[PDB]
Amino acid sequence: MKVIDPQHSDKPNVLILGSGWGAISFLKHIDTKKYNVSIISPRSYFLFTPLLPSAPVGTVDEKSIIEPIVNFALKKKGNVTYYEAEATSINPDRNTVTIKSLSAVSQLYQPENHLGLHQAEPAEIKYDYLISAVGAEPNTFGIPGVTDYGHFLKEIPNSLEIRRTFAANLEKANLLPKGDPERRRLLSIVVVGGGPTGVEAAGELQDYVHQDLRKFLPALAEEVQIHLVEALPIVLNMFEKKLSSYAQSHLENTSIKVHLRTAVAKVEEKQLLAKTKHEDGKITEETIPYGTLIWATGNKARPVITDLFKKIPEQNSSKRGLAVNDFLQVKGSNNIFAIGDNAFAGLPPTAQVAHQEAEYLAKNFDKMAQIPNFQKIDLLFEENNFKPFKYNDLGALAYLGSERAIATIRSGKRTFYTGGGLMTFYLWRILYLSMILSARSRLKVFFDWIKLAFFKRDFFKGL
Amino acid sequence: MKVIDPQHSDKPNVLILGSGWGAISFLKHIDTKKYNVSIISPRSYFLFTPLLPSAPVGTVDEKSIIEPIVNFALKKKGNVTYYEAEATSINPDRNTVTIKSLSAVSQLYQPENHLGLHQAEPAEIKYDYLISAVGAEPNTFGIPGVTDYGHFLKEIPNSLEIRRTFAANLEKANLLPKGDPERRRLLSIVVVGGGPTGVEAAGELQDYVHQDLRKFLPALAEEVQIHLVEALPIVLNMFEKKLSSYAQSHLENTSIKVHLRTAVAKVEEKQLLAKTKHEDGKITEETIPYGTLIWATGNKARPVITDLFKKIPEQNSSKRGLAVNDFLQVKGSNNIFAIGDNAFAGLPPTAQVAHQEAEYLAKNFDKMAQIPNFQKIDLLFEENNFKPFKYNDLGALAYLGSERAIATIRSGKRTFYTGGGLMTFYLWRILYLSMILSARSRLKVFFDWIKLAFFKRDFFKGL
Ligand SMILES: Cc1cc2nc3c(=O)[nH]c(=O)nc-3n(C[C@H](O)[C@H](O)[C@H](O)COP(=O)(O)OP(=O)(O)OC[C@H]3O[C@@H](n4cnc5c(N)ncnc54)[C@H](O)[C@@H]3O)c2cc1C
Numbered sequence: 001m002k003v004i005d006p007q008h009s010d011k012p013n014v015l016i017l018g019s020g021w022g023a024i025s026f027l028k029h030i031d032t033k034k035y036n037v038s039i040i041s042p043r044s045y046f047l048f049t050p051l052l053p054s055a056p057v058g059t060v061d062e063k064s065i066i067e068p069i070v071n072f073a074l075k076k077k078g079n080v081t082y083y084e085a086e087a088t089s090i091n092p093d094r095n096t097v098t099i100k101s102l103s104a105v106s107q108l109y110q111p112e113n114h115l116g117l118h119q120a121e122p123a124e125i126k127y128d129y130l131i132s133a134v135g136a137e138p139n140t141f142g143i144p145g146v147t148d149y150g151h152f153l154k155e156i157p158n159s160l161e162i163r164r165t166f167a168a169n170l171e172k173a174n175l176l177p178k179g180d181p182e183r184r185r186l187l188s189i190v191v192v193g194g195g196p197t198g199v200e201a202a203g204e205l206q207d208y209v210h211q212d213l214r215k216f217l218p219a220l221a222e223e224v225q226i227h228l229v230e231a232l233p234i235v236l237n238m239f240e241k242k243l244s245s246y247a248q249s250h251l252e253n254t255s256i257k258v259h260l261r262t263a264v265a266k267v268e269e270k271q272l273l274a275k276t277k278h279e280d281g282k283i284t285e286e287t288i289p290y291g292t293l294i295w296a297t298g299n300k301a302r303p304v305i306t307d308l309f310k311k312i313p314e315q316n317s318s319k320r321g322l323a324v325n326d327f328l329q330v331k332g333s334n335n336i337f338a339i340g341d342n343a344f345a346g347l348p349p350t351a352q353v354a355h356q357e358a359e360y361l362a363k364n365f366d367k368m369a370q371i372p373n374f375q376k377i378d379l380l381f382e383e384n385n386f387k388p389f390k391y392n393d394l395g396a397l398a399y400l401g402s403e404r405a406i407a408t409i410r411s412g413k414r415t416f417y418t419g420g421g422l423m424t425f426y427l428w429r430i431l432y433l434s435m436i437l438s439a440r441s442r443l444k445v446f447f448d449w450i451k452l453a454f455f456k457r458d459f460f461k462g463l
Numbered sequence: 464m465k466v467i468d469p470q471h472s473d474k475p476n477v478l479i480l481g482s483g484w485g486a487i488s489f490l491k492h493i494d495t496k497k498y499n500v501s502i503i504s505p506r507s508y509f510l511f512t513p514l515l516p517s518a519p520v521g522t523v524d525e526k527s528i529i530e531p532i533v534n535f536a537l538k539k540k541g542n543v544t545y546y547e548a549e550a551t552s553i554n555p556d557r558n559t560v561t562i563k564s565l566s567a568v569s570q571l572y573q574p575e576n577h578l579g580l581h582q583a584e585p586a587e588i589k590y591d592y593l594i595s596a597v598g599a600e601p602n603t604f605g606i607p608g609v610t611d612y613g614h615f616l617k618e619i620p621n622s623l624e625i626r627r628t629f630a631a632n633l634e635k636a637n638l639l640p641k642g643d644p645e646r647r648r649l650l651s652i653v654v655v656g657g658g659p660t661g662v663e664a665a666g667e668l669q670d671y672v673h674q675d676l677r678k679f680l681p682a683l684a685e686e687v688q689i690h691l692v693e694a695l696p697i698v699l700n701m702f703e704k705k706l707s708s709y710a711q712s713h714l715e716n717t718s719i720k721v722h723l724r725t726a727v728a729k730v731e732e733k734q735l736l737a738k739t740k741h742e743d744g745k746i747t748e749e750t751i752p753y754g755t756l757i758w759a760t761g762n763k764a765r766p767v768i769t770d771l772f773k774k775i776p777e778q779n780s781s782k783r784g785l786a787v788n789d790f791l792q793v794k795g796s797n798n799i800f801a802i803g804d805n806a807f808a809g810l811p812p813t814a815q816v817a818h819q820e821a822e823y824l825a826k827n828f829d830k831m832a833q834i835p836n837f838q839k840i841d842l843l844f845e846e847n848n849f850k851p852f853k854y855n856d857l858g859a860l861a862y863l864g865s866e867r868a869i870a871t872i873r874s875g876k877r878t879f880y881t882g883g884g885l886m887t888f889y890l891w892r893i894l895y896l897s898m899i900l901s902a903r904s905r906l907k908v909f910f911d912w913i914k915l916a917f918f919k920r921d922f923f924k925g926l
Pocket residue numbers: 017018019020021022023040041042043049050051052053085086087088133134135136153154196197302304339340341342349350351352354
């Protein structure tokens with residue numbers, strides 16, 4: 001019950017799902033004069049995910065790396081409306097999306113209507129076109145105990161939980177005598193994932209220990225131990241072998257214990273069971289004690305996308321994400337589009353792919369809105385003549401702790417970069433500053449870093 | 464049970480209670496080479512209380528106006544030890560202090576001993592001399608319902624509660640239609656207290672409304688209403704009448720409803736009952752609806768100080784604080800000293816009084832530690848010949864919202880200042896920056912303000 005249908009305006013309604021890289025990038029490029037745009041997302045702000053790993057340890061403040069949606073919508077010319085709630089069910093036949101847990105409603109540049117909605121009231125939102133960018137969720141691979149004792153590294157709350165756990169453990173450990181094995185376990189951290197997120201997480205945690213903790217509790221600092229576990233035989237496999245090797249050496253020089261060729265079998269309250277697969281082809285078992293477990297491995301489709309597979313006939317055989325055209329239209333649907341991690345197009349699940357797809361699609365919509373036929377929809381994309389999406393891989397970046405990073409930079413064919421260590425660390429900072437989406441967030445992180453040069457990190461457990 | 468008694472060292476032990484203005488100021492001046500210093504306080508950091516009223520609304524970040532104790536202790540030459548716990552009982556006869564709720568132990572410049580203490584374990588701490596600076600706690604004057612529905616404005620947690628309440632109310636109000644009286648109550652704020660803390664609190668809240676809220680929800684911003692209630696007939700009575708008048712005019716120009724000659728009789732869930740005492744000597748009743756109640760009135764002795772009145776014979780007739788000498792020694796005690804709000808010496812309860820008493824006392828201790836007799840204690844203060852404490856009133860300051868402040872600056876006899884409006888607002892900033900106790904906190908607030916010039920306040924309900 002309750003159906004919101006704003007269409008006194010003669011414009012078509014483009015409904016967006018999410019407030020991440022795909023949704024915001026699309027929002028920034030979509031012509032709000034041609035269409036009435038509306039966003040649905042339980043998250044009232046945009047997260048700059050590449051700096052998330054610096055948040056727990058206080059290299060950057062959590063407020064520094066987020067930006068309210070309304071600030072993006074405010075710079076838009078036309079009307080934009082944000083429903084603070086999550087999409088539960090996508091309804092192709094009805095052309096609606098069901099919502100749950102209404103926390104707020106914002107209607108920018110729309111001084112007129114009144115919805116008449118109580119909080120947590122179920123509803124249905126009409127649409128003419130739908131862009132789906134809810135993203136994925138973390139994958140535990142069905143390995144028991146991960147959700148009970150692990151911390152994912154996906155969202156701002158996760159940064160606060162990791163700080164609270166680790167601060168708690170440091171306080172406890174400090175009361176026990178230098179020998180105690182419990183002291184040793186409480187000071188043990190385990191990051192699962194050999195990719196960029198995991199490496200950066202181990203790097204930042206190590207930075208905090210060597211730089212901040214050592215200055216007022218050197219005793220505790222010496223006994224802390226950080227493990228990095230990865231199933232593949234090479235860390236950061238998306239780079240050339242030469243850069244991966246340097247990466248692995250450096251991590252071990254900064255005293256991080258790297259566990260390659262290693263899968264996790266089970267996760268318990270105080271330890272995890274791992275199977276390591278050696279060069280001679282033999283498998284061994286080892287226990288890894290821990291006090292804080294960061295889970296930074298791959299992705300899995302969300303319940304809303306899974307529920308959509310059952311409804312569209314040709315979307316049956318789909319698991320990783322939604323099956324999509326060369327034009328980023330959802331296969332089998334008349335008007336549903338998909339971008340980012342929640343959409344399969346044989347491309348990686350990365351922020352670079354989300355942004356470029358978002359722009360492409362936004363560009364097309366602004367082109368599509370200059371025709372009588374768009375004012376049935378599938379054949380019109382071709383007749384008028386315009387190009388499909390061509391991803392342009394720009395490369396990869398990764399901070400490795402202790403003022404060192406690796407970089408590969410390119411455009412299509414040619415490659416040009418500086419990807420060693422300290423100088424690449426400086427390039428790394430500049431580029432990241434450059435690709436932050438807002439000026440406020442950019443000044444905030446700049447100040448965080450200036451402050452970090454002179455005074456070192458804030459690491460409060462209650463804040 | 465369990466008694467910690469560190470005295471392998473030949474030095475006397477000066478035990479400090481608290482981590483506020485008196486304790487930290489004393490700590491910075493006490494010679495750690497002459498004495499073994501130890502702090503007991505449940506709060507692991509120092510709070511810069513004059514900027515606390517800018518925290519809720521995000522003019523300054525909560526992290527910006529606090530500084531961990533260990534940073535102060537680290538700059539000290541000798542040994543310093545901090546017990547993260549609260550003093551429960553002061554024991555003159557035994558010369559000990561009982562403690563509760565052990566969260567942590569820090570022993571800076573002391574790479575040796577091990578206490579062997581579990582968390583939340585009761586204990587007793589030996590001492591030779593004791594400096595008491597626990598401060599006071601808020602006084603509700605026995606007016607019912609204050610602690611049930613009000614927010615005190617005393618500590619960092621209070622800043623977070625006020626933001627959470629107010630953000631919640633704004634979100635709710637926004638869903639109701641422009642008429643609704645509930646909408647009007649949810650947008651109503653009430654600050655109790657005509658002194659500086661209360662005035663500043665009303666000013667900051669009004670700044671947030673006019674500057675930030677109006678830019679994205681002008682409709683809500685116009686209907687917000689802020690009340691200031693004060694029992695005395697004049698706001699900010701500690702200034703000359705001429706400055707108080709300007710203060711009151713300005714507050715009313717910025718659309719704040721000031722209620723003078725008004726006492727609060729009772730506080731309910733959605734309103735408060737007040738009695739106003741008019742010029743013709745008649746008393747009236749009025750209800751003041753509200754959604755957020757900030758209680759910023761006076762002080763009251765803490766249970767630890769009250770419990771000490773019963774034990775010392777001549778400390779019986781004492782209520783506001785501990786009765787104290789011209790040398791700041793506790794009357795009736797051999798070795799207990801009191802500074803700040805928890806000590807009565809016919810002086811105001813202000814930060815300026817705490818700092819000067821702290822220095823005086825610290826100075827004396829460093830002088831007292833160059834004699835055979837100090838190596839019984841009461842008569843030695845006089846025989847060697849040195850002066851009593853003479854407070855030097857430097858004046859008063861107060862921000863009044865909308866870039867205006869009042870100032871009175873002086874030293875003893877002479878008075879010299881600039882105490883009008885906008886120019887006094889600039890002086891106000893400089894002086895406050897100048898009397899922050901640490902460089903980190905000083906840069907942090909400076910950056911907050913630079914950021915505030917270009918981008919306006921962060922006002923997140925979860926952060
Ligand atoms: C810690 C970390 C670091 C990373 N670092 C990098 C990096 O350095 N470089 C790089 O290229 N890539 C990086 N990535 C990858 C990148 O963040 C993702 O690939 C990208 O966010 C995917 O874009 P998206 O819009 O599909 O999903 P997201 O950006 O995750 O956004 C999804 C949005 O949908 C919302 N949502 C969730 N569920 C629902 C629902 N049911 N209904 C409605 N809305 C919903 C969420 O609130 C969120 O705002 C990183 C990822 C992580 C976790």
